[PDB]
């Protein structure tokens, strides 16, 4: 929630406390699309092209 | 209009319009002037065009401002042209 939209990230947690499960292979990363403060959810673009 | 014009002794009208280096004998376009800033008792010699910066010797104030072409003096000061030689 504290990272600005459009920022490149890695080692993303899919659940709070998972300690990192997404974008862990060489040269991989995710992109932050948008935030939703009403529901507290963040939308990302995965390395495979899917959105989560 | 009946006058016949020769090239060795051109008339004043046609010579006053020519570009320098296009006259019969080229020459400068500039001159020097004595500039007295308000007060300070001092007289300075300033070039007409003077692309550089100029400060009065006494008051350490700028006298002229650079410009493409002739320089412009600050509002207070008044100048006086000097003879060519």
């Amino acid at each position: 929630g504290q990272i600005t939209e459009g920022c490149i990230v890695c080692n993303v947690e899919a659940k709070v406390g998972d300690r990192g499960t997404l974008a862990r292979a060489s040269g991989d990363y995710c992109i932050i699309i948008s935030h939703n403060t009403e529901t507290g959810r963040t939308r990302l673009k995965l390395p495979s092209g899917q959105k989560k | 209009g009946f006058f016949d014009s020769d090239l060795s002794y051109p008339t004043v009208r046609t010579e006053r319009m020519k570009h320098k280096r296009r006259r019969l004998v080229q020459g400068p376009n500039s001159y020097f002037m004595d500039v007295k800033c308000p007060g300070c008792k001092n007289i300075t010699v300033v070039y007409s065009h003077a692309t550089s910066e100029v400060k009065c010797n006494g008051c350490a104030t700028l006298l002229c401002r650079p410009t493409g072409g002739k320089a412009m003096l600050v509002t207070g000061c008044g100048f006086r042209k000097k003879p060519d030689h």
Partner: protein, 89 residues
């Protein structure tokens, strides 16, 4: 180009594996064994030691880089984006 006209470092492979696979691997082989500029100490002393690990002979620093080159073009873009977003706060 006294010993070899165009093979270069790939001359150890003899007449095997094909010309185009050899050309593609030659570009990455040269940069992987080259000496790269070190920003910490201002020397050309960065050398690879296993994929993605670069060590400087001068200041003895280790950096996480990219496979066959010290820095990848994607990394350069990312550093500029993050700097602008930090300055935006």
């Amino acid at each position: 180009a006294k010993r070899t006209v165009k093979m270069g470092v790939m001359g150890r492979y003899g007449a095997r594996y094909g010309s185009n696979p050899r050309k593609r691997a030659k570009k990455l082989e040269v940069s992987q064994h080259a000496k790269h500029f070190c920003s910490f100490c201002g020397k050309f002393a960065f050398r690879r030691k296993a994929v993605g690990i670069w060590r400087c002979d001068g200041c003895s620093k280790t950096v996480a880089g990219g496979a066959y080159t010290l820095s990848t073009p994607n990394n350069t873009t990312v550093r500029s984006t993050v700097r602008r977003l930090r300055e935006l706060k």
